[PDB]
Amino acid sequence: MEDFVRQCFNPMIVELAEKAMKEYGEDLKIETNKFAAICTHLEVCFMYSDFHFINERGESIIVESGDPNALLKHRFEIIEGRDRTMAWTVVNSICNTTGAEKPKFLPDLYDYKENRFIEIGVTRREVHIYYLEKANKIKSEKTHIHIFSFTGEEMATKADYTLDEESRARIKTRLFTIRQEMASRGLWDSFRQSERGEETIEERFEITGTMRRLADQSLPPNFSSLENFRAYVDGFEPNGYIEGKLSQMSKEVNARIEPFLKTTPRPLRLPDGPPCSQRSKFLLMDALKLSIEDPSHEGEGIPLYDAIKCMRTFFGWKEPNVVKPHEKGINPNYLLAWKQVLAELQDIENEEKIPKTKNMKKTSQLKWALGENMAPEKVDFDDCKDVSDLKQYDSDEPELRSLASWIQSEFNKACELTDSSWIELDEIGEDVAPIEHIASMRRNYFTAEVSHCRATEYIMKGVYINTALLNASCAAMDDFQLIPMISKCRTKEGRRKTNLYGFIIKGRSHLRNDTDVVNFVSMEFSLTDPRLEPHKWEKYCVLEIGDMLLRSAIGQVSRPMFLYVRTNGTSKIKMKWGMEMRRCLLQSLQQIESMIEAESSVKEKDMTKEFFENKSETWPIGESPKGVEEGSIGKVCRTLLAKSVFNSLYASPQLEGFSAESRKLLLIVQALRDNLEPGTFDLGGLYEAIEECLINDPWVLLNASWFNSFLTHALR
Amino acid sequence: MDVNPTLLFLKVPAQNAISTTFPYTGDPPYSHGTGTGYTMDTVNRTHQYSEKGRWTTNTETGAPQLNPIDGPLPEDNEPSGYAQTDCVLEAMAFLEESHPGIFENSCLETMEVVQQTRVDKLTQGRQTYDWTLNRNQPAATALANTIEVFRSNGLTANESGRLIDFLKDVMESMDKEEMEITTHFKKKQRLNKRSYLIRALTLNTMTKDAERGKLKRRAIATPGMQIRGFVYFVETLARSICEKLEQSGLPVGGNEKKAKLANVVRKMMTNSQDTELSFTITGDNTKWNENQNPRMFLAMITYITRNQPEWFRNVLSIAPIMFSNKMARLGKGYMFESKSMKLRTQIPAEMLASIDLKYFNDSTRKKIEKIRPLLIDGTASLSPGMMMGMFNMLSTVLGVSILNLGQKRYTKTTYWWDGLQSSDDFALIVNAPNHEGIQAGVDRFYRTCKLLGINMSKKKSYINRTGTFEFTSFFYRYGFVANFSMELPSFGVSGINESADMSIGVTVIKNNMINNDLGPATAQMALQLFIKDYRYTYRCHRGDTQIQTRRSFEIKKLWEQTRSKAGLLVSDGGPNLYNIRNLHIPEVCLKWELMDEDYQGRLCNPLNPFVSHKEIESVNNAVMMPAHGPAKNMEYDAVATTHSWIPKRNRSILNTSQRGILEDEQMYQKCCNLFEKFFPSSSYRRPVGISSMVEAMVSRARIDARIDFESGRIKKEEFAEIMKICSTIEELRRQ
Amino acid sequence: QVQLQESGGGLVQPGGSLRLSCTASSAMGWYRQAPGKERELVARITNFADSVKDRFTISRDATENTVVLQMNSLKAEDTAVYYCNGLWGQGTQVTV
Amino acid sequence: MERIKELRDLMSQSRTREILTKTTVDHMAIIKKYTSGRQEKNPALRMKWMMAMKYPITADKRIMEMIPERNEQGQTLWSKTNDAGSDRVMVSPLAVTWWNRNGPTTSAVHYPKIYKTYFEKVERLKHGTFGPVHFRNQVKIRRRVDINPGHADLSAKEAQDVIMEVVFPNEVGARILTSESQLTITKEKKEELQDCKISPLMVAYMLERELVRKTRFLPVAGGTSSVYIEVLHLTQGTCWEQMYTPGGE
RNA sequence: GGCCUGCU
RNA sequence: AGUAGAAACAAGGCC
């Protein structure tokens, strides 16, 4: 039958009908009479629509061939011959522009004169039944319907026929051409009734070929095919198989509970080796401040001018000389770098306006100090294979180092009060609710407690230094840059003040990965002689740069004044995390506020004021040789703030591992102290897990010592 | 006196101050170089936990595979992957018996979803291993490349737009003699059957960064695109199953987890009378993923899909069949340094099979020596067990089956147990009349776990009396206690854009106040610090200050120009009006009545060249990877302002041989923008159909010109011009 | 490196007092030279010539880098040009 | 006119012609998401790192013809170098602030009508009345509650057709909404937003947010009302309760 | 010496 | 040298 559509109809219509065939997903080889019927429907749609044009009037202009002009409007514009999505697109667009009603089924054409749709259907059966059939299929329709049938008859409601009658003679001539051409073909044994509305399909997902063999190799050891295994599974029913293997399984497979008593836990062993060194990016306990007493705010001002003005406030400069060498570098380079920094600072002082940011010369001194041109050149393996020295990067456990007493004192003095306010908080919306007033009062109390704390000063120092370093690295990637360490505080009298700890020289910072390292050299003034705790300054070079006179009742001290100079490095991640050190304030004060709220849930009243003023209640916050010492809530605030600050400063994988594996043991010990009969399956394994995190970090070793002290004081 | 914060625990219980034990204020550990060492170590460890299995050689991939299932029962407490098929089938049968109709229903909804799912659902995924280029690429890019290759090779069933048809094409590709791929350096290369099989069965290995809570780094894996559809269907089934199990806690959030934990502890302890003792085990499973054999997941799913259409069973079984034969790419490689000659070199991992061992240290030398037998075409066969939690939900199903297997109806003894399982972590409440009963119950639970290939970490687990325990960093002490140290890293600028960062910060403060019991004063301090960091990050200072920045001049002139300066946004250098009462209001709407009409109009102008919206999914959704958890998405309330710009892209593609991808990106985006202008609903609802672009665009041009004349700007001259231009593009597409 | 500016010289009666100062912008001091005589040390900062002990007092402010010389009980023999040193000033006349 | 003209210009060049011809409508989404840009793992680090560069943001090409290349002192506002995989050009953040002080102005009166949810929140809070804070232990129990206070009793899909018919009336397709509540919602949001020119996508997104019901599990103590849950952070705490009555009541 | 890139 | 820690940075590539 398909030979007929090969022969007669034009290409355009046959591929339109083929795409309509693909539309609903049925195959053309099984039933083709539908293809012919609907392609004839589509053909009558065209032949009825084309050759029919309109101009600004009604009364369509009919031309056998559209002449070249703007007057190519089509009388009837076709609906079908398009995908369902576009057919409904045209339906909705016509409804929204023509203000007509939206039909629920697919029309075939639209006309302007009568501003409505045409649903053309030419069926094998006579018209006077198919018409009202499709009419009762369509609900309350104003779209006019018109149908032909092979006998040659026409019909329509309203007795309406919308265009010329010679066109309809055309239609029925086409119709009988179709008819008495099948006459030569002979199809009416099924042509009248060949489609009955079949819609059914079964989804087929068949495993075959290579993928089947893979299925045959992904079974238990004693199975040969997926078919057999699935049959076995379907036939499988529970018949007490877990019990049999449990009985047969060796009894050494057990989870015996070892009781956890007061005498069970042993102190954590600390590693032994050379004392632990300093790792901070700046001096914490041995910092010195040169000040100007200016009225500018933290960010307000220009760095270089402030630094120069602060440094001019000090008199007593001496020619620098080596006091304590780096022990691994070239100290003369550090000396020359310091003198170069001074010289270029003067050079800025001379000229017209202090630059906002200064670049330094790339001398051999800072070329060595900043580690320039030291990365091995990257080459290909095929060119370097016979080199005996060629091997992997050194990948082994870090060097072992024992704890020293300097970190303990540094933390002790990091929780001490100061003679300045190191936090100038921002603005918030004016409090409107009583709860907001309570929150503001609490916040004011904590700010009064923690602002005068060395932890806040360290927070500001780190934030400013890391912000400046990151910005300089991102801006001046190539050229070495000078950045004075600046921090602005407020005195007890209320006068604002600036403080200059020293200088940082940032080097080449072409940082691609988050782990890539930018090297800088840090110089900081101090008065602490490095000849008393040399092991804490393994990586520092310390010079003697001047003498300071601070008013004291013992005449006047006239102390020496040294310069701690070192080469340090950071990374994008480290800079970003060090510039978010202000969340240590959060951590600490959230803990304290949780304490206050928990206690106030007992007594139905806010308990902040008496906690902060009466200072009757105290918490164990340290141990003295006499015994455990307790301090007021403010001291707890400062201690927790210092702990968070040191966590942010000495952060490392060792800290995370020890924190987790020691929190586990802390929970076990707490369960013991709560009389909850705690038990363990392998306590030695937990101890070994904790002890492997303690390698060389001073902070984690101090935490381990604190944990041992807590165990000793606990378990009683 | 020496200060010691830990001594604070002598007065404050450990859980009431547990936040102090979370050093989440410093930089988390990161990996620096290759992850090849970790990948090799994981492969060797997975293969040696199942050493007593039986060896075979796949006839298709030619790789050695180790099957430990039904192997000898363990005789020691060391990790073992010798799961027994009959035991696990019985466990699943008991799970079904205790929850009748679970499998049949879940299979019904899964069948509905599979037969109505679309291909585009695969684009909604993070990095995936594209085999066309042998590298990780965004899910959409890899899917597009694979579809292009399939269409070039003759597999065009995916044009039906159905994921099931895409999987049919994927499987049909397995039986092809020779496929063709494209490489740029364009060159057409031919892949034989075995090479393509291994490229479709392989995984890409990387090192996990920003992982807090352990000293050593780990390795993670990413699968290809051929196997992700089957994984999607299997995980849909597993999620539908677990949603019907109250003992599971994987498909829920954190608060639901806490609620279920409280309910189970109350149920276990309350029902226990005075005579019965109760004990809670806070258990962690050692080597959870390395001991879960994909064959056992195949067994579980084929038991689940019993009495179901065979096509459903086949499509759900394809995934574990491929995992059982999965291969893993070793990784980036190894970098060597020579200090004598002062140079460095980078050898790819694919050379580990043949490269001499003189360059490697003792540990790496032994690892390579042990893993070499499993090396096939630069990748190692990893049949014995899963790599990194790809089947999280099925593992949770197995754990829930174990938990339910002790409902006192199967124990047949006075002791019994229950609890909650979330993959790699569990809380087990066991009750028994005497300490001997508790010991026997825990021993039998451990033994049954060892029969299913699941191991309990004795070093990271402990048992106490009920009332105090831990679960996924949630510490329960007669009621869950807030931590607030897990969410600390999320208190900074997110890094999306100005308005997005502001809204996300305020919303995070609000949420942590609601859930994590953040205090009022602490919340105010957090708001102040966040505002300070926000102003210092975006160079948007109050405007009345003299802080010179790269943006302080325009901000200051805008400040001096504005009359009601209280309406200026913090992004434009205005005062901050936020407070505890205003944390749930966008900044634009909070300052709407205070803005001057000129500034208000300039700010919220639709014609601004900065705002760009791509799809309904990416309107106000921000992907923030939370600390100590999987990547998560958040809805943030924000008004589309001129500050909603999107930041610069990487721009490093220009120096790579894969430079033509940018031209293809530009052309695809131009075509997509044209289509959207032709089809405005393209973004909100993704268009569907089987036609091509130009057909729809030209035909809609026809119709829209028509109707927009029937009322609108068009004129006959223009309408006819459009009609004949449509004809022109038609004849152009002809040729 | 340092520049030295003297002030406070002039004309004074026998038994009178006069105050010199030196603004400097190690040791600093005052020297004097009388007509036809060599330049002699007066005081430095302390150390003092025997001729001026109990009569002349030197002090130093390090903050402002200033070295005052208070001269009391002046005599005709103290008539000289007085020079600051740290480097030399220009010299300031003192006539008793 | 224009649209078909850039269509013809695209089809003029062979590569785009092939892309338009061979690519089917269904693959629309795929190729639209086809990109070499990886999703950032650490957005904060790079946002703090990119903002230190010049020209850190991106904007459409049209910015080159509305904003001058430099400001009064000569600080550059935009660059002509396009982004990696787009025709957009990289520009400095000042071009934002500049746009807010001398850029074109419009009538933003209809934004309150569009962003109905946020302005309703503001109005509800502005007329709220606070009360005394009572300090007592709060038994926070976890419950499933609806957060959206303006949901019109419609699901996502249920209101998606309404949203399309309100914004994209022609792409609705087969669906014609039956429920009369949807009829009235369509009428109201059609006549209200008849000429709003913000964007079809944002209008659809905000209509989805407003009409679609959404639910989440939260620890609550009292309240349980939709209006009382949006301020759950302000009314309920660990040991304090703040009586509050939104402006709506 | 000149120019390109900074998660590809 | 320095940062850092089971492998890396201490710029890369292209002419």
SS (H, E, C) chain D: CHHHHHHHHHHHCHHHHHHHHHCECCCHHHHHHCCCCCCCCCHHHHHHHHCCCCCCEEECHHHHHCCCCECCCCCECEEEEECCCCCCEEECCHHHHHHCCCCCCCCHHHHHHHCHHHHHHHHHHHCCEEEEEEECCCCCEEEEEECCCCCCCECHHHHHHHHHHHHCCCCCCCCCCCCHHHHHHHHHHHHHCCCCCCCHHHHHHHHHHHHECCEEEEEECCCCCHHHHCCHHHHECCCEEEEEECCCC
d(CA C22, CA C7): 6
Residues 6+ apart with CB under 8 A from D159: D152, D182, D207, D208, D211, D212
Q: Which two tokens stand for residue A235?
A: 């036939």
CATH code at position A43? 3.40.91.90
Of the partner residues B17, B89, B475, the one whose CB lies closest to the CB of residue A233:
B89
CB contact under 8 A, A249 and B71: no
CB contact under 8 A, A651 and B23: yes
Contact B469, B418 (CB under 8 A): no
Nearest Cα residue to B122 out of D201, D173, D26, D21: D26
DSSP-derived 3-state class of residue A649? helix
Contact A47, A174 (CB under 8 A): yes
Q: Which residues pair with B457 in a beta bridge?
A: B284
Contact A714, A666 (CB under 8 A): no
Return the DSSP state at B564: S
What's the gap in Å between the CA of A92 and the closest CA on chain D? Answer: 5
Contact A4, A36 (CB under 8 A): yes
Q: How far is CA B408 from CA A527, B87, B411, D37, in A?
A: 73, 18, 5, 55
CB contact under 8 A, D32 and B669: yes
What's the gap in Å between the CA of B166 and the closest CA on chain D? Answer: 13
Contact C22, C28 (CB under 8 A): yes
Q: How many CA atoms lie within 13 A of A242 on its CB side?
A: 26
Written as one letter, the residue type at D73 is Q
d(CA B152, CA D81): 35
Residues 6+ apart with CB under 8 A from B480: B258, B261, B262, B474
Instruction: Identify from A292, A293, A314, A315 which residue to disrupt to test chain C contact, counting C C-beta atoms within 10 A and taking the largest count.
Output: A315
Helices and strands: H and E segment counts in chain A: 23, 20
DSSP-derived 3-state class of residue B224? coil
What's the gap in Å between the CA of C1 and the closest CA on chain A? Answer: 12
d(CA D9, CA B674): 11
Nucleotides of F under 7 A from a protein CB: 1-13
Q: Which two tokens stand for residue A320?
A: 């620098």
Contact A422, A489 (CB under 8 A): yes
d(CA D207, CA A426): 37
Residues of A near D (Cβ–Cβ under 8 Å) read 84-85, 88-89, 92-93, 96, 102, 104, 432-435, 438, 470-471, 474-475, 514, 572-573, 576, 579, 594, 597-598, 600-602, 604-606
DSSP-derived 3-state class of residue C93? strand
Residues 6+ apart with CB under 8 A from B47: B66, B374, B384
What's the gap in Å between the CA of A576 and the closest CA on chain D? Answer: 6
CB contact under 8 A, B159 and D75: no
Whether the CA torsion B352, B358, B362, B366 is positive or negative: it is positive
Residues of A near C (Cβ–Cβ under 8 Å) read 315-316, 549
- For B249-287, b/e burial (b = at least 16 CB within 10 A) is bbbbebbebbbbbeebbeebbeebeeebbbbbbbbbbbb
Strand intervals (E) in A18-167: 76-78, 109-111, 116-120, 144-148, 154-156
CB contact under 8 A, D37 and B161: no
- Using the CA of A513, give the nucleotide whose C1' is nearest: E7
Return the DSSP state at A114: T
Contact B616, B470 (CB under 8 A): no
Compute CA A15 distance to the chain's CA centroid, rounded to the nearest angstrom: 51
CB contact under 8 A, A316 and C65: no
Q: Which residues pair with B181 in a beta bridge?
A: B189
Domains located in chain B, CATH noted: 254-289+389-481 (3.30.70), 490-635 (no CATH), 652-734 (no CATH)
Return the DSSP state at B33: S
- Using the CA of A378, give the nucleotide whose C1' is nearest: F12
Overall resolution, Å: 4.1
What residues of A are in contact with residue D42 (Cβ under 8 Å)? 514, 573
d(CA B723, CA B700): 11
Q: Which two tokens stand for residue B447?
A: 């033994």
d(CA A314, CA A628): 43
Q: Which two tokens stand for residue C17?
A: 């007092």
Compute, in degrees rounded to 10, the torsion defined by CA atoms B358, B364, B366, B367: -130
Checking DSSP bridges between strand A116-120 and strand A144-148, what pairing results, if any?
A: parallel
Contact D191, D224 (CB under 8 A): no
d(CA A275, CA A536): 8
Angle at the Cα of B510 from the Cα atoms of B505 and B515, rounded to 5 degrees: 125
Strand intervals (E) in B540-670: 621-624, 632-635
Angle at the Cα of A504 from the Cα atoms of A502 and A506, rounded to 5 degrees: 175
Q: Which residues pair with B183 in a beta bridge?
A: B187
Contact A118, A128 (CB under 8 A): no
Q: Distance in angstroms, CA of B133 to C1' of F13? A: 21
Nearest Cα residue to A246 out of B86, B201, B263, B533: B86
Written as one letter, the residue type at B711 is S
Domains located in chain C, CATH noted: 4-95 (2.60.40.10)
Strand intervals (E) in A48-183: 76-78, 109-111, 116-120, 144-148, 154-156
d(CA B15, CA B480): 9
d(CA A693, CA A654): 5
Which of C 1-60 lie inside 8 A of A, CB atoms? none
Contact B159, B168 (CB under 8 A): no
Q: Which two tokens stand for residue A472?
A: 């300089």
- Using the CA of A370, give the nucleotide whose C1' is nearest: F2
Give the range of the structural domain holding residue A65, as residue numbers without chain letter.
1-199
Contact B321, B298 (CB under 8 A): yes
d(CA B552, CA B562): 15
Q: Which two tokens stand for residue A400?
A: 């072992």
Residues 6+ apart with CB under 8 A from A77: A49, A109, A110, A111, B703, B706
Residues in chain A: 716
What residues of A are in contact with residue B31 (Cβ under 8 Å)? 515
Contact B531, B576 (CB under 8 A): yes
Nucleotides of E under 7 A from a protein CB: 4-8
DSSP-derived 3-state class of residue A367? helix
CB contact under 8 A, A619 and B215: no
Nearest Cα residue to B142 out of B226, B235, B204, B199: B226
Q: Distance in angstroms, CA of A474 to C1' of E5? A: 14
Angle at the Cα of B710 from the Cα atoms of B703 and A57, rounded to 5 degrees: 120
d(CA D56, CA D60): 14
Return the DSSP state at A271: P
Nearest Cα residue to D23 out of B12, B159, B51, A110: B159
Q: Does D173 touch chain B (CB under 8 A)?
A: no
- For A239-258, b/e burial (b = at least 16 CB within 10 A) is eebbeebbeebeeebbbebe
Residues in chain C: 96
Question: Is the CB atom of residue B711 positioned under 7 angstroms from any atom of strand E?
Answer: no
- Which residues of A does the annotation place in the binding site? 41, 80, 108, 119-120
Angle at the Cα of C26 from the Cα atoms of C22 and C31, rounded to 5 degrees: 45
What's the gap in Å between the CA of D118 and the closest CA on chain B? Answer: 7
d(CA A701, CA A697): 6
Contact D146, D213 (CB under 8 A): yes
Contact B598, B585 (CB under 8 A): no
Compute CA B656 distance to the chain's CA centroid, rounded to the nearest angstrom: 28
Written as one letter, the residue type at C67 is V
Q: How far is CA B501 from CA A548, B581, D22, D27, D174, in A?
A: 48, 19, 41, 33, 41
d(CA B498, CA B529): 16
Long-range contacts of D94-97 (CB under 8 A, 24+ apart): D94/B550, D94/B551, D94/B553, D94/B554, D95/B610, D95/D57, D95/D59, D95/D63, D95/D67, D96/B571, D96/B610, D96/B642, D96/B643, D96/B645, D96/D57, D97/B551, D97/B554, D97/B555, D97/B558, D97/B572, D97/B573
